[PDB]
């Protein structure tokens, strides 16, 4: 009934898509959602529309889209919302898209940054 | 003696720089480092070279540069390392040493954050 779709930038290099895959893999083993799908905005498949369609196919009526970006930007305020038909200018059913918020300057980002400083 | 320099993409929108600022503020409040500086790769000040120079001025000899990016990419493999003179293409004293660190990557804590975000927390 619920689907989590992780969505990321995507690059020509593969590292952007490896991350999303890894993250999706880690959320799967937490057994929080029935369906979990990734979608990359550019250069790589699956594409955001592809992910959403796949989630619908597996029977989800709540599609939670989470933007895996540190900071808001044009990609999150325009590009992705369009792709999701949340903004004027992929057509869903009676299903509902719930577009969530980016990572932002979470306390946990500070935690991670500190470890990185020390090579952990 | 040691400086943490947080380095980010930078955009024409301000959100990227605000992120860096907030993070730097939080690191300051943890009292782990003497000098803490942010540098944005494009479109904004301070610039990476500016941040490194500023850190040297305040007297640091260990410059820890952390790339605040989720994933490696050309910006972290090439652009930033050039700006740091770590890779053949501003100018660093013999006294100081750059320690270029690693990105966030698919940390367990990123999964934690993602879940909270999914729930509107």
Swiss-Prot record, chain A:
It catalyses: Co-sirohydrochlorin + 2 H(+) = sirohydrochlorin + Co(2+); Ni-sirohydrochlorin + 2 H(+) = sirohydrochlorin + Ni(2+). InterPro entries: CbiX-like (IPR002762), SiroHydchlorin_Cochelatase (IPR023652), Sirohydro_Cobaltochel/CbiX (IPR050963). Its EC number is 4.99.1.3, 4.99.1.11. It comes from the Archaea. Ni(2+) binds at residues 9, 75. Substrate binds at residues 45, 70-75. Disulfide bonds: none annotated. It is an enzyme of class 4 (lyase). Homotetramer; dimer of dimers. This is Sirohydrochlorin cobaltochelatase. It comes from Methanocaldococcus jannaschii (strain ATCC 43067 / DSM 2661 / JAL-1 / JCM 10045 / NBRC 100440). The lineage of its organism: Archaea, Methanobacteriati, Methanobacteriota, Methanomada group, Methanococci. The gene is cbiX.
């Amino acid at each position: 009934m619920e689907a989590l779709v992780l969505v990321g930038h995507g690059t020509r290099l593969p590292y952007s898509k490896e991350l999303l895959v890894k993250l999706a893999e880690k959320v799967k083993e937490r057994n929080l959602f029935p369906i979990v799908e990734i979608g990359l905005m550019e250069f790589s498949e699956p594409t955001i529309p592809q992910a959403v369609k796949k989630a619908i196919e597996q029977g989800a009526k709540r599609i939670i889209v989470v933007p895996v970006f540190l900071a808001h930007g044009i990609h999150t305020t325009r590009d992705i919302p369009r792709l999701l038909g949340l903004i004027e200018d992929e057509i869903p059913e009676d299903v509902e898209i719930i577009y969530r918020e980016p990572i932002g300057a979470d306390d946990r980002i500070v935690d991670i940054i500190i470890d990185r400083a020390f090579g952990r």
